Amino acid sequence: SMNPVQLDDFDAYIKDMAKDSDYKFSLQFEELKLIGLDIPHFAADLPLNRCKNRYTNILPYDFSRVRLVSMNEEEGADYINANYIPGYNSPQEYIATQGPLPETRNDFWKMVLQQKSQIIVMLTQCNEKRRVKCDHYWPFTEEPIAYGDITVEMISEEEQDDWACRHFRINYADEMQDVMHFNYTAWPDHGVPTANAAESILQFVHMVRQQATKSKGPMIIHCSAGVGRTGTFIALDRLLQHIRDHEFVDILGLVSEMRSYRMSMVQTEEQYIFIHQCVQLMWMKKKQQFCISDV
Ligand SMILES: [Cl-]
Ligand SMILES: [Cl-]
Ligand SMILES: [Cl-]
Ligand SMILES: [Cl-]
Ligand SMILES: [Cl-]
């Protein structure tokens, strides 16, 4: 479950991964399916926490789960469906979480505050094609809204074709924190995304990364399950940095590592292949960069 590939061999690699109706893609993916099967998630299974999980089979591992501050000995007080994930720069660079439910939106804001996260990435619209994905857990207007103990004011909201950016100021009594929220709204349909789809997503990943160099705390990433589009964005973000610095990539290693921190990161084979497609584009662009001589 690591397979590092030299970038000047990546073209031939993906052609081989693609032969026989993507057979080697499937085989790697079947390797990945096994990662984390015997890592405990006892907390995720507590009775009082059943209603805090969007899905019954997307549960946070106990070792990497994010804990909320607990006033109580009440069961599951500290629980949220979120895990820390390593990144390119730090071992707790990200938090991958499900899209908040109405019943957990308060818990979600508590996490943002307690974790001192200044960046939230949302890879879904609240509803898509008449299916619920995520509660609209932030305000609709500029008027501050109380979410349990934490008030959120939208300071600004900028909408583009494929994404929107929102500045939130959050407070808990005398404690105040500023948070940027980035919502990608054009996540492609099943199955082979266009060239423009891949380019749009890479542009989005680039913009979030620019804000991350200015900020501190974990970067919170969610979709609906907090595994599929979420793992994909995290993979892409790390791969962008990696490919800037190196002449090789290990995508298999990368997803294997992520699945050790949260189950089912990169949910589908189609997403796994999409990562490879995005890496082919990153490589093309780096090769364009090679035609400029500075040093
Ligand atoms: Cl950890
Ligand atoms: Cl850390
Ligand atoms: Cl403060
Ligand atoms: Cl890795
Ligand atoms: Cl996809």
Residue numbers in the entry: 914 to 1208
Original paper wording:
Protein tyrosine phosphatases (PTPs) play a critical role in regulating cellular functions by selectively dephosphorylating their substrates. The ∼280 residue PTP catalytic domain consists of an α/β structure, and biochemical and structural studies have led to a detailed understanding of the catalytic mechanism (Barford et al., 1994; Zhang, 2002). Key features of the domain include the PTP signature motif, the mobile Trp-Pro-Asp “WPD” loop that in the closed conformation positions the conserved and catalytically important aspartate residue, and the phosphotyrosine recognition loop. Here we report the crystal structures of 22 PTP domains, including two tandem-domain RPTP structures and a detailed structural comparison of this protein family.
